[PDB]
Design a protein around this ligand. Structure first.
Ligand code: EAU
Length: 246
């Protein structure tokens, strides 16, 4: 997250932190995710495609720090890693960049809700907020595009939904952006998602309800003028989600 503020997991308690084990046994951060039910985390396929063995991944919930344990956290193995069959990678865009991880403890349990661990509701189908709506993003991704390190403390910021019309302009992303993606950005381009934030939540208020409107997917650089954050449009994937989680 470029700009924004530091936060803790109580302000985004559906946030899942996903890590990968190495043959070395070094364990490193991969991507965010969102808890949509006790046993299921939703994330982005591009995070996992190069390394698609489920045994390779660890999932934390209730975690506010990247390389230290948060009081109350839960650690899980990945029982099922479901990547979207129609996924693809352009030069920049990822299509169908959505993934599901079924989580289970060493002890066989899914997540137990608590003050630091809650699910996030899915949107109704084809039901997104109006353009210009303010939503929030959360992640352990880079604070500057050129940083080598990820931040140790979870971050969040606010971005505004951009219309497809505007995001499809050639000085924005042209064709790269499809109806299955949402664009979001700062009017001053001063705050944004970045590398390491992929898979994480774009959350908006609709109804009276915090709703997983988007999943961090791609962008041309970070907090760069005329280059919004691009997000998977969750409300265009409900049958895929339900089919793979029933
Ligand atoms: N909101 C945005 N403007 N951008 C992003 O959301 C975003 N950006 C990058 C990125 C970092 C530097 C240039 O681009 C990035 N990367 C690094 C490139 C390799 C592919 C996936 C990981 N992932 C992202 N999700």
């Amino acid at each position: 997250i470029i700009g924004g503020e530091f936060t803790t997991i109580e302000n985004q308690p559906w946030f899942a932190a996903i890590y990968r084990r190495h043959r070395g046994g070094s364990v490193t951060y991969v991507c965010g995710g969102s808890l949509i039910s006790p046993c299921w985390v939703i994330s982005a396929t591009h995070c996992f495609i190069d390394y698609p063995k489920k045994e390779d991944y660890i999932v934390y919930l209730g975690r506010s720090r990247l390389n230290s344990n948060t009081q109350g956290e839960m650690k899980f193995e990945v029982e099922n890693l479901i990547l979207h069959k129609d996924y693809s990678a352009d030069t920049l865009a990822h299509h169908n960049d959505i993934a599901l991880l079924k989580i289970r403890s060493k002890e066989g349990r899914c997540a137990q809700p608590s003050r630091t661990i809650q699910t996030i509701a899915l949107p109704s189908m084809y039901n997104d907020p109006q353009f210009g709506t303010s939503c929030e993003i959360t992640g352990f991704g880079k604070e500057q595009s050129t940083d080598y390190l990820y931040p140790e403390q979870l971050k969040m910021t606010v971005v505004k939904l951009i219309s497809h019309r505007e995001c499809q302009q050639p000085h924005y992303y042209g064709s790269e952006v499809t109806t299955k993606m949402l664009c979001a950005a700062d009017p001053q381009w001063k705050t944004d998602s970045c590398q390491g934030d992929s898979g994480g939540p774009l959350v908006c208020s609709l109804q009276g309800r915090m709703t997983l409107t988007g999943i961090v997917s791609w962008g041309r650089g970070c907090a760069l003028k005329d280059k919004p954050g691009v997000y998977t449009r969750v409300s265009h994937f409900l049958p895929w989600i339900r089919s793979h989680t029933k």
